[PDB]
């Protein structure tokens, strides 16, 4: 994982279970994926019970951030130190 991190970065999480993104803001996760938590582009876009981030490997490959990021069910992941 990386220690040079995305703009406004808050903390990381790690997927405990796998998740398939159903809709047009949502992020895809595999059980074991680190996700770099970031703050939202608007407060109305923050869904209740959701988190926004980008996958750490998606960011360690240095891909298009604004297309690689998404919202995920925080309850699929764990807060890592």
């Amino acid at each position: 994982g990386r220690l040079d991190l995305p703009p406004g970065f808050m903390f990381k999480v790690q997927a405990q279970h796998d998740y398939t993104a159903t809709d047009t803001d949502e992020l895809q996760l595999k059980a074991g994926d680190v996700v770099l938590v970031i703050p939202f582009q608007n407060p109305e876009e923050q869904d209740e019970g959701w988190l926004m981030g980008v996958k750490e490997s998606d960011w360690n490959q240095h891909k298009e951030l604004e297309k690689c990021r998404g919202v995920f069910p925080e309850n699929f992941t764990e807060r890592v130190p």
């Binding site: 279970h17 998740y19 608007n42 869904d47 209740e48 019970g49 069910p73 309850n75």
Partner: peptide
């Protein structure tokens, strides 16, 4: 067995005439 469930997403940017 024992899998989590994603929570309900909410309305935003709503506007009508």
């Amino acid at each position: 067995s024992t899998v989590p469930v994603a929570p309900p997403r909410r309305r935003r940017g709503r506007n009508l005439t």
